Amino acid sequence: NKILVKQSPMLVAYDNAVNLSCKYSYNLFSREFRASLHKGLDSAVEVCVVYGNYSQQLQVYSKTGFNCDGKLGNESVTFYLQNLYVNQTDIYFCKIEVMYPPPYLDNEKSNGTIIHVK
């Protein structure tokens, strides 16, 4: 099986910042997971990578010249993107994998979320 992903269809960044919540159909409390944000239709660029611990600790990484921050919450991960450029207006996709406790699962392709940076 696969995890489900609900993300807002549209978000306007105000003052070059936005909060992208990725809603999963899985209990990420006390789980070893790896959440991802990808930008672009071809999902090439990986914007942010939020690794989750069993003891609900987070290791957030911002890879491609993005200012990313991460917050965990039950069946969701929130990506707080700051200092976005206007030229970064695009479709963003939430990705997830759970490893422990088993089984290993990944997400079914989400519809994405259009971020308009103003």
Epitope: Y54, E97, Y100, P102
Partner: antibody, heavy 116, light 114 residues
Framework: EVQLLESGGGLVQPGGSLRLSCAAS????????MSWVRQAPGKGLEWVSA????????YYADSVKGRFTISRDNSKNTLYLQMNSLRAEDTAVYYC?????????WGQGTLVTVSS | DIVMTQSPDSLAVSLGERATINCKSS????????????LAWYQQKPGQPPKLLIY???TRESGVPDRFSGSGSGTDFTLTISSLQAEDVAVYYC?????????FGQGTKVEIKR
């Protein structure tokens, strides 16, 4: 028929490096987490490391941290283990295992002997 | 650092009679979210790679006979072979898969008493 076939083991000097491989068939390799489990001759099983179906998440045992690296090529259906800075203690039969709720399938094993 | 301790180290039981192996976890491997205990049992015959028998403490793997049965929750667990067969002489291992690093018990050697 699911098959896991290990290779790359044998005799190596202490301090030296060895790379193990585990080829898979008979299932969608990229859909499952893989592990390496080792068993020293006449001893119990010791979990070594695990890698997600995608390769994005890797975990390691306390004893092998900083020395061993678990990787995979889903296009080749092969799982790798890069053992560096080997010690005598690392001598064991190295199994590769497919996970789903537990280790539901195990390979035959490849014998790594670390000795001068 | 979740430690698994089995008992006994060795066990000899007559053909057809009941065998019991205990496995004690140093921390509760009961996941409160789905009430499942993340504990597995393997059988390892000599010179052969291990074989999964039980997972989620009591759920029996495809093709494992009715006689193997896992039981317990939290920290103490039990594997039961109702009617020991000749083909069951192996070393049994318990294993937690709740959190990394995954850890195994020391193993229990089961023998036929004759």
């Amino acid at each position: 028929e699911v098959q896991l076939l290990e290779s790359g083991g044998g005799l190596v000097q202490p301090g030296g490096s060895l790379r193990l491989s585990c080829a898979a068939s008979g299932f969608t390799f990229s859909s499952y987490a893989m592990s390496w489990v080792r068993q020293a001759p006449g001893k119990g099983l010791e979990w070594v490391s695990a890698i997600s179906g995608s390769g994005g998440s890797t975990y390691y045992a306390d004893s092998v941290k900083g020395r061993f690296t678990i990787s995979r090529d889903n296009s080749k259906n092969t799982l790798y283990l890069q053992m560096n800075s080997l010690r005598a203690e690392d001598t064991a039969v190295y199994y590769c295992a497919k996970s789903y709720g537990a280790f539901d399938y195990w390979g035959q094993g490849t014998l790594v002997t670390v000795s001068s | 650092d979740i430690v698994m301790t089995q008992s006994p180290d060795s066990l000899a039981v007559s053909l057809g009679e009941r065998a019991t192996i205990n496995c004690k976890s140093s921390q509760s491997v009961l996941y409160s979210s789905n009430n499942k205990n993340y504990l597995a049992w393997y059988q390892q015959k000599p010179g052969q790679p291990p074989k999964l028998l039980i997972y989620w403490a009591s759920t029996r793997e495809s093709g494992v006979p009715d006689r193997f049965s896992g039981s317990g929750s939290g920290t103490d667990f039990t594997l039961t072979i109702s009617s020991l067969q000749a083909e069951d002489v192996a070393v049994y291992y318990c294993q937690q898969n709740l959190r990394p690093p995954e850890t195994f018990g020391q193993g229990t050697k089961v023998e036929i008493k004759r």
